[PDB]
């Protein structure tokens, strides 16, 4: 099964990006909170010229999955661990809040 597909029923405005790690993806994250969705992992910074920037990752986006690992319930150590270990093209499910 696609272990991440359910995310698009819980967050139907979420989207999938494919970002190649070349040295880095180009993001930082925090464990934070948003009024509309609660606590979780959010993009907190974005590196100029990076592949994440080129793929349309935005500061403030909620990070919902990394490849096949769901990050809806991940703590900071686990989410950053997933991002650091991933190689090649890294699939991220992101939700821009607006």
């Amino acid at each position: 099964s696609d272990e991440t597909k359910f995310i698009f029923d819980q967050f139907p405005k979420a989207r999938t990006v494919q970002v190649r790690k070349e040295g880095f993806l180009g993001i930082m994250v925090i464990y934070g909170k948003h009024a509309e969705v609660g606590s979780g992992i959010f993009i907190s910074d974005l590196r100029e010229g990076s592949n994440a920037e080129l793929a349309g990752v935005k500061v403030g986006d909620m990070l919902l999955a990394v490849n096949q690992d769901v990050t809806l319930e991940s703590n900071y150590d686990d989410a950053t661990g997933l991002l650091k270990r991933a190689e090649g093209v890294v699939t991220m499910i992101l939700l821009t809040l607006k």
């Binding site: 880095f24 930082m28 910074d45 590196r47 500061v59 650091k84």
Partner: peptide, 19 residues
């Protein structure tokens, strides 16, 4: 490879620690 330090879109500062 690309440098570990890069420009923050939030602060404009050159920082490391990129994922």
């Amino acid at each position: 490879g690309p440098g570990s330090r890069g420009k923050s879109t939030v602060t404009g500062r050159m920082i490391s620690g990129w994922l």
